[PDB]
Structure formats: structure tokens, C-alpha cells
Design a binder for these strands. Sequence first.
RNA 1: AGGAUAGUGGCCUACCAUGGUUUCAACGGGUAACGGGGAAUAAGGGUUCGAUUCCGGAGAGGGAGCCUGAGAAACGGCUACCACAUCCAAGGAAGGCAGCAGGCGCGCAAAUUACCCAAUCCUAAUUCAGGGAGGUAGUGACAAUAAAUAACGAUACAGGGCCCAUUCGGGUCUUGUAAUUGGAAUGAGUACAAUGUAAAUACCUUAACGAGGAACAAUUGGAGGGCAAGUCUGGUGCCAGCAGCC
Lengths: 134, 53, 144, 130, 185
Amino acid sequence: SDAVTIRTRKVISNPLLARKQFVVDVLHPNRANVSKDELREKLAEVYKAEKDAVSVFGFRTQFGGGKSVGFGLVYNSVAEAKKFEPTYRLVRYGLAEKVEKASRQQRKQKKNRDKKIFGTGKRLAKKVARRNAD
Amino acid sequence: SLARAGKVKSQTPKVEKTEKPKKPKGRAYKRLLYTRRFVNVTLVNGKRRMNPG
Amino acid sequence: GKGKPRGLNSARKLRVHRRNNRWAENNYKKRLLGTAFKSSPFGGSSHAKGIVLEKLGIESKQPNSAIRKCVRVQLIKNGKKVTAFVPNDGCLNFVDENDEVLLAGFGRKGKAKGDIPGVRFKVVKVSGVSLLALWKEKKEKPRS
Amino acid sequence: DKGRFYAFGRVFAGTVKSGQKVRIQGPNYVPGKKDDLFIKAIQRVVLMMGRFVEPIDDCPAGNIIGLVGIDQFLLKTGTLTTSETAHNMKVMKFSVSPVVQVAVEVKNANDLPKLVEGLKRLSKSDPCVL
Amino acid sequence: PRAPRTYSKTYSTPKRPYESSRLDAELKLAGEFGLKNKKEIYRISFQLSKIRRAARDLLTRDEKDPKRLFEGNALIRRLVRVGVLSEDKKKLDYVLALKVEDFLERRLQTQVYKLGLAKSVHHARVLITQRHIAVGKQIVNIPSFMVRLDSEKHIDFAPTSPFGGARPGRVARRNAARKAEASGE
RNA sequence: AGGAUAGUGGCCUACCAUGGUUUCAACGGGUAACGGGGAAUAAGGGUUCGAUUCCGGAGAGGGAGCCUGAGAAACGGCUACCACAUCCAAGGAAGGCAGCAGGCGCGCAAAUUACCCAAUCCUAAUUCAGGGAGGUAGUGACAAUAAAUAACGAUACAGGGCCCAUUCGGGUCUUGUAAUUGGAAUGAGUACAAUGUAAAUACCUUAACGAGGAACAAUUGGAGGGCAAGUCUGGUGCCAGCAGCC
Ligand SMILES: [Mg+2]
Ligand SMILES: [Mg+2]
Ligand SMILES: [Mg+2]
Ligand SMILES: [Mg+2]
Ligand SMILES: [Mg+2]
Ligand SMILES: [Mg+2]
Ligand SMILES: [Mg+2]
Ligand SMILES: [Mg+2]
Ligand SMILES: [Mg+2]
Ligand SMILES: [Mg+2]
Ligand SMILES: [Mg+2]
Ligand SMILES: [Mg+2]
Ligand SMILES: [Mg+2]
Ligand SMILES: [Mg+2]
Ligand SMILES: [Mg+2]
Ligand SMILES: [Mg+2]
Ligand SMILES: [Mg+2]
Ligand SMILES: [Mg+2]
Ligand SMILES: [Mg+2]
Ligand SMILES: [Mg+2]
Ligand SMILES: [Mg+2]
Ligand SMILES: [Mg+2]
Ligand SMILES: [Mg+2]
Ligand SMILES: [Mg+2]
Ligand SMILES: [Mg+2]
Ligand SMILES: [Mg+2]
Ligand SMILES: [Mg+2]
Ligand SMILES: [Mg+2]
Ligand SMILES: [Mg+2]
Ligand SMILES: [Mg+2]
């Protein structure tokens, strides 16, 4: 129970994206750089939404300290949050986990290898197996 | 012939410096020149000079 | 009247006289003629890497005495042979035969300087190291 | 390419990764002071075949590999490490010493700069050409 | 490609480098205002003569001239706005008289020493730099801040940093800590 | 008059005419010449530059030719020849970084064969896919902004404004020398944490760690003049060497 006292300004509602968007001003004297996950667990208790439908980012904190500034926005339903928020943010809260597919060099590198082949190469395995050698 | 390249830079008897206290490299250097120029800079002598004898 | 055209419609002869009479300006002509490139052993380059052909000290000129410690240098970019001063006390044990060496200009915008007859360049680095860093015991020539 | 030398050796400790800062300790280095110590990095580690080399990013200890990114800093042989006071390795003398010798002048008078870099580049190529 | 992020230069060097009179006049202000560079003076005199000789051009404009008035009482606007002109002077002409001297006096480095607060300007800057003083809820640590006289009194210490509560200072706390053993226990 | 072009036109062709430009510089020659918005220096007037973040143009080793297509005389399209030059089993085949990286060469002269579509945007059958466009980081003293390398005492020493006073000074204000000494202040670093981000690195916020000289040790040129600062000390003795000029 510390003086953490977070404001929220420039609140204007965005129906077309099914959300309210707004800047946040966390006046946190005698405290430094309050986290993002902690900036929700009883933040949704302020705009009355449930707890996995909120998102917030931005967040570089004033010179001299004692207050951080950034941007947040809350959703009219968590179901649409999983549809509207970038597919990298749900990673940050564990609501998705993006694919392990190899480095983009290998993706391009194999992208080009498969231009060397015309059709399926299913006849190609039949090519090389009988040969090597005679 | 060539013969006399290092004729003095060698034959000067090379001597070491004096590992003397460090001078205040910064703003306070301007300070202590302000002092040894205007305030009790007991360096006056007639009209003024800046080297001993 | 003061010896030049002064009518309002005069500005052709005026601008043209200035062009011809600009040729009497020495460095205007040096700029237009491109004596930068045709003459002058550099191409107009700030410096030029070169190769030390032979250590050679050349006579002083009056009123002074004192041999002058130069090197005949073949330039890498055009194989022109030129001589250049190796300035300082010593600074000729630092060069051997065939050392790579970077020659700079001398300050007089070409056309040689001071004590010395007909030499317009000075050594700065020899086999990659500045003379200063070698002349003071700061740095050391690479391992031959 | 034109005259620029992989370095060819075998590593006995640690690993080597493409793009890694390393101290090279030439044949004259001792852990004490200014010696044959250059401190640059390795452009690519690469393992070698009948002169086609296959770039690999990491190599353990106990293998032979190449090293492109040096030989501006080596002259014939060297031992490069990662520890401040890792001594060198014994100088590895062979049974032939450089004995047959001739003088080399350049036919044309002006190729001379090409001849003096060649000798440097030649010294690098064979382990005991002088 | 990109879009050029512009930059200007902030000073201007004297044309004759070894004027006897000028050389001493400069050091007198460095002593007066605890500066470190000659650039720190070159910065103002350039900036002033930038502002100065960009007001010479404003009166060959023969008067009632529309641009002269708007950029007039909206320039002077900015110059007591920073306390280098008076409200007892709202009328445009003494601006060219203004010396370099008036600008230094509203550096935050110099204003510290003059609000009590330092007892010496060399002591003022050294403390300006060390995340002491603030103006609003806002720490500032740049010895050249140019107070606005709209904040000439909001200048205080910082609530971080001893001298303002809440933290007692690294050098002190580590010292008095070692008196655990010898206090009796 | 016609042909050809998407179309006007000697654009081309047949016929016909003898005209067209020029000392108000035609034509030629040179450019170490892409043009421009601009850049530098500037009392004014000007002088010098503009390969290069925008616009237009021109090229894709050199010429020419062409396909497809609305659009290309395209070159990360084809064909021929010229110049290089790769692989071969010698039969043949294949070429084009002045795209991003990286390398050679050239040189006085210029960076990593890294990450990514999160942003700006572009394309597509298209909300998803693709983008070395572009963005992120690496290298980076090209250039620019801000501005650490100390503050304050005590003691011993050094000088001087002073109600009641004959004053070693009795008392004074401030002020500098020396390894004689004290307690505060701090980030440069280093680092839980969050923040930062696509994921990271540094920035900012920050727990703990982080200052007394032999350091958390500032440099570069200078000290006859121009030109700010030595008639100091030792060395050499028209020698070494300094010196833009004298
Ligand atoms: Mg007329
Ligand atoms: Mg002529
Ligand atoms: Mg003439
Ligand atoms: Mg004549
Ligand atoms: Mg003379
Ligand atoms: Mg080189
Ligand atoms: Mg080769
Ligand atoms: Mg703080
Ligand atoms: Mg027709
Ligand atoms: Mg031109
Ligand atoms: Mg051209
Ligand atoms: Mg031009
Ligand atoms: Mg141009
Ligand atoms: Mg241009
Ligand atoms: Mg060019
Ligand atoms: Mg084209
Ligand atoms: Mg083409
Ligand atoms: Mg290409
Ligand atoms: Mg293309
Ligand atoms: Mg090319
Ligand atoms: Mg080279
Ligand atoms: Mg460069
Ligand atoms: Mg290079
Ligand atoms: Mg994108
Ligand atoms: Mg995509
Ligand atoms: Mg800089
Ligand atoms: Mg330091
Ligand atoms: Mg001297
Ligand atoms: Mg003088
Ligand atoms: Mg000197």
C-alpha cells in the first residue's frame, strides 16, 4: 500500500476497434519504474473490464524519476483483444506463442532451393536411387 | 656519410620528469587561473610577468 | 569617365573583360589550366603513399649551413621519383631501404620551402607509423 | 581471391565462433608487456576441403580449421588465445633451414612496389621462406 | 533513404585569437560564473550576435511595418520571459544594448548561488550536476537552464537526494554503517 | 505527296526548291561537367562547390537487336557480336552486385558475408504471403548538441574594512602556498529489477557495489616577432636540428 497514484488522460472511446484508448501517467514517487503486468491486475478493476482484455506499452519514464508515462488501451471483450492486438503482444502475456520456424535466412535459403525443382521431385527420388553408382 | 642522425636527441642526457601532484584538469583549472591572475596572485612585480628568474 | 563602359546596356563587355583579366590572376589560372593534374607529381591529392629509394641528405642553402636529411621516394600511384624531407633530430635511422612511406605536402601550396633547395614534401608515416610516434619513443616500427 | 590467406591451425581449448574478439600471440609474445599481441576479431571460421571451405559459425577444441579474418596480423605462424597470460606454444622448428638463396630484382624498373609486397605475401605462404 | 535530421552549431570563435584585452575579459566571467570552456562564452556571444544582428535588420524596415511589430513585442516577449529584460521595459529598443553579461546571470548555475543556496558558484554547478535541485516536480542538472522568472521561485532542492529528504547519501550511509560493531553492539 | 508512329514533325521516302546558324560568338575544342532544390564563406556586392537523404534525367561490363506486356528498347528478361571470364568426363554448359552483405584491385581516401517485417510503406488472387525497399543493431572522433575529470571544511601559514581604545596589534572582513589533516556529494563504471524492443543492445528509472592523489592520474600544440606565454636551468656549438614568413 504505497503512494503509486496512477492518472489516466486523453481517454476517448474507439468503437470501430472495439476499445477505449488512452495515455497513462503513473505518478510513483519514492518508487522506480513500475511494471506492466502489475499495471493491470487491479487496473482492470478501474475500467471494470476483466483482466486479460487490457494492453499497455510505450513507457519511458521522466528524467529525475518518480513518474513514468506511456500509452494503454482496454477492450470491450477479451475475445476481440486476441483478434485485434498484434500477434506479438499476446506472446508477451502468454495468450499465443509464435512459431519456431528456422531463421529467415534459412526460410529464404530454402525458398530459393525449391525454385530449382519444377514439380514434386517424387520422380526424382526414383532418379538418383538407381544410380550412384550404375 | 649519414653519420649524425641521432646527434642530439641521443646526446642530450635524458632526464626524468618530477612525479609532482596532479593539476586540476577541468573547470576548477579556470578557477585557479582566475585566482592566480586577479585575486591574491602575489605574481605582480613592477607591472607583470609570468615566468621565474 | 573612368575608363570602363558605364552604359546600362554594357553588361556584355563588362562581364567578358572580367573573364580575360581573370587569367592574370595566378591561382585562377592554376585552377582552370589543370596544372593540378598535368604537372605536379600528385594528382592534387592531400598526400601520397610512396617507397623509399635511397636515404640522401642534400646541401643547405645560404645563409645557413646544416645538411638536410631527405629520401628519394618512388610514388606508388605513378612511379614518379621525388625527394622529401625527413624532419626531426635523428629520424633517418627510422627509415631503411624500401620502407613504405606516406608523403604529405609542405605548406607553401607546392613550390619548396625554407632552408632547402627544390623539395616540396615531407614524411609523415613510414611503414605505417607516424614519425612523431617513432621520433618520441611512443611507438615502434613493424617487425621486419 | 587475390593473395589474402586463410589461417590454418588446430584449436586445443575453448571454441571459436564467427565474429569473435581474440588476442593473437605471435612467436615472440610473453604474457608480460607489448609483444606480438594484436587483439582483433575473426571474420569467419571455416573448415577446409580440396579448396572449397564451408563457413561454420562455431568450432570446438580438438579439430583443425581455417580462419579468414587474420593474416594482416600473422606473418608465418602464431598462437591466438582468450586469456591474458596464456603463454605461446613451442616454436616448432623443422629439419630444413633456409639455405639456398638468390637475389631478386624486378625486370622493369617501376614494378618494384609490387615486388616488395610480394615478398611480404610470399613470406606468409611458405612456413620458412625468408 | 531517410529524411535529414538537421543540426546547427552553437558557438562562434573570435577572428583574432590572441587579443590581450579580450583574453582577460573572458576569464573574468569564467571566474565570475564558474564556467569551464571559452566555448561557454563563445556560445552566448555568438548566440547574442545572432540575435543582435538579426534585429539590426528589423528597423531599416521603416516603421508601422507589420512584421516588425509582430516579431517585435513577441520577441521582447521571450526576453523578460527569461529575465534578461524588465517589465519596466516593454518597449523594444534597449535590446541591442544587452551585453553577454545579462545572459549568464540567469543560467541556473548562477541563480543557485544568488538564492543563497550555494555560497559559491563553483559549488553551485558541482551540485547542479549531481541530481540535486529541481524546478517543478522536475530535476534539472544542466548548469545553463535559463530560468523564466515564471519558475524563478519554483527552484528548490530535490526530494530525492538528501537536502530534501528521503535519502541520506551514499558516502554518509556507508560511513555511519560501519559503527555497528563499536556502538556497544 | 506518301510511308511509318499512339500521334504532330525531314521522322523517313520520291519529286522540287536553296535555303538554315553565326562577331548579339555559330561551328569547333575542353570540362578533373549529370541538371536542379541546395552547400560553404559572407557589411554590402560577391567568390567557390553541388557524385550524394527531394524532384527530373541517364545507365545496368560495351554496342546493337528483340520478346511479353497498358507500360521495357528492361538487363536480378531473351538474342548476336566486342571485352573479360566460370565449370567440364573435352562431348558441352553457363555467365553480369553502379541491389544488400562480403572479397579483390585501386588508392590519401569509406563499415557487418548480423537480426527483422514490430514501424514507414509497396506489391499480389490478397486483412494473413513477400520485401537486404525499409527498419534494428554492429563498425563509426565525417559533421552537430549538451558537458565529468571535483566540492566544502579544520588546523598550522600568509595579507588587509572595525561600538569603548595609549596598542606586541586587544577585537576585524575576506583571502593563497606546502604528502599536515576531516566529514559530506556524486557518475564513469559494474549490476538484481523493471522499462526499452519484433527479440535484444545502449538511453531514461533504479536494490545493492562504486574517491583521496602512487588517483576514477586530460590532451594537443606553443613560450623572439606576427602571436597569448621564459632575458630559467642543463645539453650541443653554422653540428644536430628548429623556422608558414622574418
Ligand atoms: Mg543602344
Ligand atoms: Mg588562356
Ligand atoms: Mg591577361
Ligand atoms: Mg602578358
Ligand atoms: Mg632571406
Ligand atoms: Mg594501408
Ligand atoms: Mg590469391
Ligand atoms: Mg539520484
Ligand atoms: Mg505528312
Ligand atoms: Mg561544370
Ligand atoms: Mg562526367
Ligand atoms: Mg556542376
Ligand atoms: Mg552540379
Ligand atoms: Mg546533384
Ligand atoms: Mg565522378
Ligand atoms: Mg533504362
Ligand atoms: Mg539493356
Ligand atoms: Mg544485379
Ligand atoms: Mg531492374
Ligand atoms: Mg562494375
Ligand atoms: Mg592498401
Ligand atoms: Mg575516412
Ligand atoms: Mg579501405
Ligand atoms: Mg512491414
Ligand atoms: Mg507480412
Ligand atoms: Mg564529437
Ligand atoms: Mg579522467
Ligand atoms: Mg624550450
Ligand atoms: Mg607576446
Ligand atoms: Mg618546439
